[PDB]
Design a protein around this ligand. Structure first.
Ligand SMILES: NC(=O)c1ccc[n+]([C@@H]2O[C@H](COP(=O)([O-])OP(=O)(O)OC[C@H]3O[C@@H](n4cnc5c(N)ncnc54)[C@H](O)[C@@H]3O)[C@@H](O)[C@H]2O)c1
Ligand SMILES: NCCCC[C@@H](N)C(=O)NCCC[C@H](N)C(=O)O
Ligand SMILES: [Mg+2]
Ligand code: NA
Length: 253
């Protein structure tokens, strides 16, 4: 059960993100998704299954999917009984997550999505569509399960991708495997486009920021302080769950 404040925050954050994405790219979240995957929604029936491997996650997904126009429902039962319930009640897409994997499975066309690459890809896509960019230089901070697919997507779109991760071994593998330029956080290079995907605060050094730069980040907590954000007028794209979820659903349509 979402508290009233929880429900209100979900819609508020989504609308905030919709506007920020429109400001940055000229399209809303839905517009980005359709252009990214070339798919469109028909209010597909989305069955959301709670998994005991439980707070408001299912309830939050319900609000999120409703916001994006999907005919969604949360099953009464959890786990395998819930799955059965969802399929029996005509779910075309199943949405469920344990601590390790959050997936969307379209039972109609057999396409399946993982939240991690779907999130990195859409946030990278948003960042890459900054209209007033004037450079193809992009900084990626965090090359984990969300960050790496995002970097890969930016490379595939022929951007000049700089990457940093505080895990050296991972940085090495990312730099050899997709042609990203290792970035030294002591490099005083300014960026107008930044994609960040870490679970840590203060991961973007001040010296890296330009005026009005786009910072596209699914990471939690925020990659920069409120002070630096206001000081450099950073165009922030950051939202806890919905954007990635939209990316998952459109990717399997
Ligand atoms: N907003 C959303 O919709 C959404 C969806 C999925 C995940 N997330 C969040 O995104 C974040 C990333 O998830 P993930 O699965 O990629 O985690 P992960 O552990 O796979 O990757 C995080 C990476 O950040 C790196 N890192 C940590 N501190 C750093 C620093 N100071 N500089 C550079 N790199 C640093 C780590 O070495 C690690 O490789 C998490 O906070 C997760 O909760 C958000
Ligand atoms: N930062 C958001 C990325 C997802 C985090 C992940 N650790 C997570 O909490 N997954 C959801 C678990 C959902 C739970 N099984 C439920 O159905 O209530
Ligand atoms: Mg999100
Ligand atoms: Na972060």
């Amino acid at each position: 059960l979402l508290t009233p404040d929880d429900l209100i925050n979900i819609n508020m954050q989504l609308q905030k993100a919709d506007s920020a994405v429109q400001e940055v790219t000229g399209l809303d979240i839905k517009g980005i998704c359709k252009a990214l995957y070339g798919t469109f929604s028909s209010s597909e029936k989305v069955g959301i299954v709670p998994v005991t491997s439980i707070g408001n996650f299912s309830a939050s997904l319900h609000a999120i999917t409703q916001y994006f126009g999907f005919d969604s429902f949360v099953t009464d039962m959890p786990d395998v009984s819930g799955y059965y319930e969802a399929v029996q009640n005509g779910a075309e897409i199943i949405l469920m997550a344990d601590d390790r994997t959050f997936l969307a499975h379209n039972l109609k066309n057999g396409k399946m999505a993982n939240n991690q690459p779907c999130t990195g890809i859409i946030y990278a896509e948003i960042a890459s569509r900054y209209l007033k960019a004037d450079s193809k230089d992009v900084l990626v901070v965090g090359l984990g399960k969300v960050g790496f697919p995002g970097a890969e997507h930016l490379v595939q779109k022929d951007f000049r991708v700089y990457g940093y991760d505080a895990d050296e071994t991972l940085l090495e593998r990312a730099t050899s495997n997709l042609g990203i330029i290792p970035f030294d956080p002591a490099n005083p290079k300014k960026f107008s486009i930044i994609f960040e995907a870490t679970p840590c605060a203060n991961t973007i050094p001040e010296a890296v920021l330009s005026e009005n730069c786009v910072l596209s980040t699914p990471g939690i907590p925020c990659a920069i302080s409120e002070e630096l954000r206001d000081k450099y007028e950073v165009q922030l794209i950051a939202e806890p769950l919905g954007i990635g979820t939209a990316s998952m659903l459109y990717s399997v349509l």
